[PDB]
Structure formats: C-alpha cells, structure tokens
Amino acid sequence: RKLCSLDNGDCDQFCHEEQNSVVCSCARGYTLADNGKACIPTGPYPCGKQTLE
Amino acid sequence: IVGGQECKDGECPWQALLINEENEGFCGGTILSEFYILTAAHCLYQAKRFKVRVGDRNTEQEEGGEAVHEVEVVIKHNRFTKETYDFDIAVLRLKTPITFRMNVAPACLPERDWAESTLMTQKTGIVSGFGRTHEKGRQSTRLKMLEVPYVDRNSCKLSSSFIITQNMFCAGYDTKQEDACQGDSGGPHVTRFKDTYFVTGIVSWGEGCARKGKYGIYTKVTAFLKWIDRSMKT
Ligand SMILES: C[C@@H](C(=O)N1CCC[C@H](N)C1)N1CC[C@H](NS(=O)(=O)c2ccc3cc(Cl)ccc3c2)C1=O
Ligand SMILES: [Ca+2]
Ligand SMILES: [Mg+2]
Question: Distance between CA atoms of B209 and B167, rounded to whole angstroms?
C-alpha cells in the first residue's frame, strides 16, 4: 500500500494521487491548512459535525 | 428504525422530517445546505401537500429547537420507476433558508472516487429516522439511529427477490433484528471518517423489516453526485 492507499495519504478528508504524489482536499465549507493535509472549518456549523452547542 | 438507539442531543443534526397536512411525519430527508434537502423519489406520492421539519428529536412535545420550512421546488429524478424503485432520489429547494443550530446542521457531500474506495469500504454506516420500531408497529415518537454493516454485492443479489441495480446498495444484517423500516424512507445513510459524517445513501426499500435472509436497500449517493450538484444550482 502506497500514497492514498496508506492511511488515506495522511489526509483529513479527500485524497487524490497526482503524478505519483498525494494531494489532499476538503468538503465545501472547510479550507485546507498550511500543512496541506488538515481541513479547517471556515465558520459555524460546518458539514458533517455533530453539534455541541 | 428496528433496534439501534435514540439519537442523543446533537448526534443526528442532518435529519429532516417530511410532514403531511396533519403535521405527522411520513418520510425522512438529509440536510445538504441552508436551502436543500435530499430525499427519496417514492416519498413524493405518499402525500399531496407537505412541509419539512428540522431540529426535532421527540414529536410528542415542542421544546423550542424545531423549525418548519415550506418547499419551493420539488426536483424528482425523471427516471424513477415504481416497478423497480430504480433512481429513487429527489432534491427539495426550500422557500426560506434553514438556521443551523443545536440539532440542525448539514451532512457533507463526498467526491465520487474517494467515497467509493474509502467510505463504502468501511465496515459500517449509520441510518436514522422516525419510522416503525417493529414491522407491524406504529411510528417512533423519538428520533433513532442504527449502525449497519455494508453487505457484499453478490450476497445481496442472491438474497433478493427483486433486481438490485447499480444505483442501489445493501446494508444491515442477515438474521439479527436491526433494520430501517416503514416511515424511514428518504432519510440519511451516512459514513463516519475521522469524526466527520458524509452522506452515502438514501433509505429506499426492503422486503419487510429485519427479516431473516433479507437486507436493507439504499439509493447509492455516489452514482448521483453530479446530478445532485446540478440540482443544487438550477
Ligand atoms: C419490496 C418492497 C416493495 O414493495 N418494492 C420495492 C421493489 C420494487 C417494488 N415495485 C416495490 N417493499 C415491501 C414492503 C416494504 N415497505 S416497508 O414500509 O416495510 C419498508 C420501507 C423502506 C425500507 C427501507 C429499508 Cl433500508 C429497509 C426496510 C424498509 C421497509 C417495501 O419497501
Ligand atoms: Ca419536539
Ligand atoms: Mg435480515
């Protein structure tokens, strides 16, 4: 197992293999962090999260 | 939902409920955005005039987090057929935007390839709704959820008395007494990935509820991701 096949390529969300390298991305309403892997909610009530307040 | 457990506070915020003229739920839906609901095409023939309720967990009393929305446009897939239940999908545009709050939030739409290789290969998904708690009983006054194993495509084909098309998938248990049921139709099937829930199916049909040798049949959301995107713009 290599790239996206090895632990989702270390991505929080979507993983794509572009020219033999991992590329991560996020659902609408999130922005990719500076590390190019984590997904950061842009505002309140982002999709897919159970509500706490 | 047969078996499973109650959705606790904030646990199933993407659940929507279609209510008839008497303010009684007859089907479910999934919140996709402030203006759009995902549901089943076959739910549209189960009532003439209907509205959408969000934020509810107990239909016996109004605690204050519930909100009702009228439907502006009904977008039914032009290929739905009552004979096979193929293309069992619809999108609803609301007149007023949903206010996200405790128990009210959208589920995430995944990308096609990643969803098929990574979400649908997980051990389980989660189904939820206000439907019956037993095949012959009354509808549940409490919102319930249930973890359902993905079922091998070949095994499902062998078990079914009706054709399983490429627009459908199977989930649930061979003999264990847990399944979706009447009234749950149109509701969410979601898959968890790192504490984030993505829509993976729509409650569609079953030969009764939780029968031996029988599974639950869900509309495969990945087959309709482009169609959904197009419906949310026009
Ligand atoms: C076979 C199918 C039927 O009559 N069909 C489908 C095949 C084609 C045919 N024209 C109609 N049936 C039989 C009756 C049943 N209705 S139900 O209310 O018990 C029901 C509804 C939705 C369900 C969803 C899941 Cl995931 C699991 C169990 C469910 C039970 C139902 O849907
Ligand atoms: Ca209530
Ligand atoms: Mg069974």
Answer: 21
